[PDB]
Amino acid sequence: SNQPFNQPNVLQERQHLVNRQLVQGPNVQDAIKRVAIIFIYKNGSYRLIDYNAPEFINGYFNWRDMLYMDKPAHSNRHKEFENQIRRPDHGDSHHPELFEYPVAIMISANGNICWENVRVEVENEDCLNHEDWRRARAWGPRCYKGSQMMKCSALGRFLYIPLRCQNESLKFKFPSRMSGGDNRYSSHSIGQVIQNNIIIRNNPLYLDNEGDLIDYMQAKNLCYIDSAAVVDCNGLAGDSEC
Amino acid sequence: SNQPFNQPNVLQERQHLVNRQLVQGPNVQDAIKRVAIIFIYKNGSYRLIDYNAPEFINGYFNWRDMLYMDKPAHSNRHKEFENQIRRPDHGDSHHPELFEYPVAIMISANGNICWENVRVEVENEDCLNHEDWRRARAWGPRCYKGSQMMKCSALGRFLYIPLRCQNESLKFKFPSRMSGGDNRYSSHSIGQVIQNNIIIRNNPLYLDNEGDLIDYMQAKNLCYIDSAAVVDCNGLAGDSEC
Amino acid sequence: SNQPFNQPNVLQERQHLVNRQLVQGPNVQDAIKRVAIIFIYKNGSYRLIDYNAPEFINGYFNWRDMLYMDKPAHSNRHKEFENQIRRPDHGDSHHPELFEYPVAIMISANGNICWENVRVEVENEDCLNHEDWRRARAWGPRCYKGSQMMKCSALGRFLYIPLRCQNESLKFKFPSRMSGGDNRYSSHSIGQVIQNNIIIRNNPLYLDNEGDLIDYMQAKNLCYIDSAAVVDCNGLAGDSEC
Ligand SMILES: O=c1ccn([C@@H]2O[C@H](COP(=O)(O)OP(=O)(O)OP(=O)(O)O)[C@@H](O)[C@H]2O)c(=O)[nH]1
Ligand SMILES: O=c1ccn([C@@H]2O[C@H](COP(=O)(O)OP(=O)(O)OP(=O)(O)O)[C@@H](O)[C@H]2O)c(=O)[nH]1
Ligand SMILES: O=c1ccn([C@@H]2O[C@H](COP(=O)(O)OP(=O)(O)OP(=O)(O)O)[C@@H](O)[C@H]2O)c(=O)[nH]1
């Protein structure tokens, strides 16, 4: 007799592990986490700031950092508006709003992130969470938390923030999960955590429309929910029906 | 009989606690600390940089960071002056001094700060505290300390630094006090300290004159001693005579 | 009798200790470490960024940070090129290469540095070490290590990096050695390490030619190997033949 039906089936498995690798890769300690801060402007276009780090992504946008471009030609206008906002009434500023101050923020946070410890806070013009610094803290009662970000998958969550005023700024923290109960802020591991956490702030990108934006998010595999509330990217691997 | 003289006196106490709150609020762990770095220029006006953080405010101004505005129209002039200063004699620079290099620094430090551990250092053109980097350290023997800052109150101290040259830069550290003997750089607390310490550097503000400056310091409740050595703001709460 | 041949010989020793001081000075804990990142451009000139810190020098250059000057007059060109590079094909960019993107990097690292823990990595256009962020880590398999930097002396090593493409960026880490087996990331010492590590990024300097560059490196006593592979500066003290 003879048994010729021994076609190997390792290929299926190799591809399968490549698929799992993309989903589990982010969960290895010192794997990269990736956050996209996306501002929407009055011209309907976007400015996207891409962050990555292996321990935690924190940072801020002061009031000035919120603006669309802030070119030399508009520096005086922006200076005076900033004066009026951050020190009324000392700005030679003649309009209630700037064309270049955003109308909303979208945040795509991706990776092995401790959602419980995530903080996203819309601060005032001095980047504080209280009117008086003497009552301000690291984070306040109006802070956004991880569970408030819309879940796209196990890898990514997405937050929408309307800006109904033009005096606000932004402060955020997206920290890694540890490996089980191993706190790497222990003496064994903390030196490496501190020295490895180089928080990359890539130069802001300008995207004309939401089609181009969806394309970017899908290209970089960062989760995105479009203006119609449809999840177009969730950070996960491609697959066919099970 | 009847006892109609029972007018409540809780109101006095409520206001009183609001007053104490502003003075004690800064002393809660993870309360915000606030520092204003103020440069004075040859046009008699000011450039103010507002910092806040919950663990410690450190940072620096390299030589270029010292300048008033540094607009594109003056970029070449400033580049060449920087060359001559930081690498003599390689600058096509034709004047001993720049109009836009400051003549003095004022620092208003406010909050629950460990004054013993405060460091403010006027560095050389390479932002080092010795002529030769091989003898330079984190801090040097000419470093300003907390006790050298003029005390305005329990909440705030104020330092004046004359700049008699135009080759100097700045490095500083304003760290929080701990709660008694609880070192939060212990393994229990340090992760939070590190991830919470997002040092906000607000965009520099331009203030025309000292009247406008006093107004700002009083509005933001940051301590200030004016050019006549009078304490105009001390970070404390308003009150009537005791 | 009389013994008039008692000419003192302390002077020799005083100078000798001054010489040793420059070589050993960097090895005191909290002594400064100094790193020069030097880019070479298509006009044959250099842009040098001078860093110093007492605990560790880490940082990065995102893609935009790589460019020579990036003046307002060339902002549009640079924006569009960045678009095409970081999000193809969304840049209105008409040339394969920019005049202002560097052709090589030279890194002079100097001081009491733990060469074993040094990391210098040429990242892609998103400043990641893998094509897909989900497989990216703090550092990757193509990372440069301390032993790959050409040794100039006990104080300094020098690395050359050719840039054969124009999509790459940079991330680096140069950490201090500890005093023997005393890990200052222990609870006793870590607060000071964290608060003292103010990583100075001096404004980029523009140097016309290699003669001017050699002069700078020798003036600042940072190690340098010239285009002919000759060590012109090694960070050590001057001396006569032994
Ligand atoms: O960030 C921005 C940028 C531009 N702009 C808008 O650009 C326009 C350019 O200014 P104008 O076109 O109105 O010229 P102008 O000299 O009359 O300016 P003002 O009298 O208003 O000072 C201004 O009217 C302003 O509203 C903003 O409001 N915000
Ligand atoms: O930061 C600054 C800004 C401006 N300035 C001053 O602005 C003035 C503008 O320069 P000028 O008005 O003298 O024109 P110019 O072409 O003659 O310039 P030079 O011959 O001096 O190169 C210069 O004389 C300079 O002293 C500074 O010195 N420092
Ligand atoms: O970073 C830089 C800076 C300058 N340049 C170069 O400067 C030159 C200035 O551009 P041109 O002198 O070609 O004028 P132009 O209006 O024809 O520009 P294009 O048609 O090429 O858009 C361009 O040809 C560009 O190649 C760079 O390529 N990269």
Residue numbers in the entry:
A (entry chain A), B (entry chain A), C (entry chain A): 2 to 243
Provide excerpts from the study.
CPV20 has elongated V1 and V5 but unlike CPV4 they do not interact. CPV4, 5 and 20 lack both ATP and GTP, whilst the other cypovirus types have varying combinations, in all cases the V1, V3, V4, V2c or V5 regions of the protein adopt alternate polypeptide conformations. In CPV20 the V4 loop is similarly shortened whilst V1, V2c, and V5 infiltrate the region. NTP binding in this area is only observed in CPV1 and CPV20. The pyridine in CPV20 is not well ordered, but can be identified as UTP based on the limited space and the hydrogen bonding environment provided by residue 101 main chain nitrogen and the side chain nitrogen of H79, whilst the triphosphates are supported by two lysines, two histidines and an arginine. The pyridines stabilise the dodecamer, although in CPV1 the CTPs also interact with each other, whilst the UTPs in CPV20 are more deeply buried in the trimer interface. In CPV1, 14, 15, 17, 18 and 20 solvent molecules can move between these two voids, whereas in CPV4, 5 and 19 they are blocked by tyrosine residues. CPV1, CPV19 and CPV20 were resistant such that only a small portion was dissolved in an hour while the other six cypovirus types plus the two deletion mutants dissolved dramatically. In fact the three CPVs (CPV1, 19 and 20) most resistant to alkali buffers all display more extensive interactions between the 3-fold symmetry-related subunits of the trimeric building block – strengthened by either pyridine binding (CPV1 and CPV20) or numerous protein–protein hydrogen bonds.
Cypoviruses, members of the family Reoviridae, subfamily Spinareovirus, possess a single capsid layer with turrets and are commonly embedded in crystalline occlusion bodies called polyhedra, which are formed in the cell cytoplasm and mainly composed of a single virus-encoded protein, polyhedrin. To ensure the delivery of virus particles to the target intestinal cells, allowing the transmission of packages of infectious virus between hosts by oral-faecal routes, polyhedra are disrupted only when they are exposed to the very alkaline pH environment found in insect midguts. The fold of all the polyhedrins is highly similar – a β-barrel core sitting on a base domain, surrounded by a common array of five helices (H1–H5). The strongest intermolecular interactions define a trimer composed of a cluster of three β-barrels sandwiched by helices top and bottom.
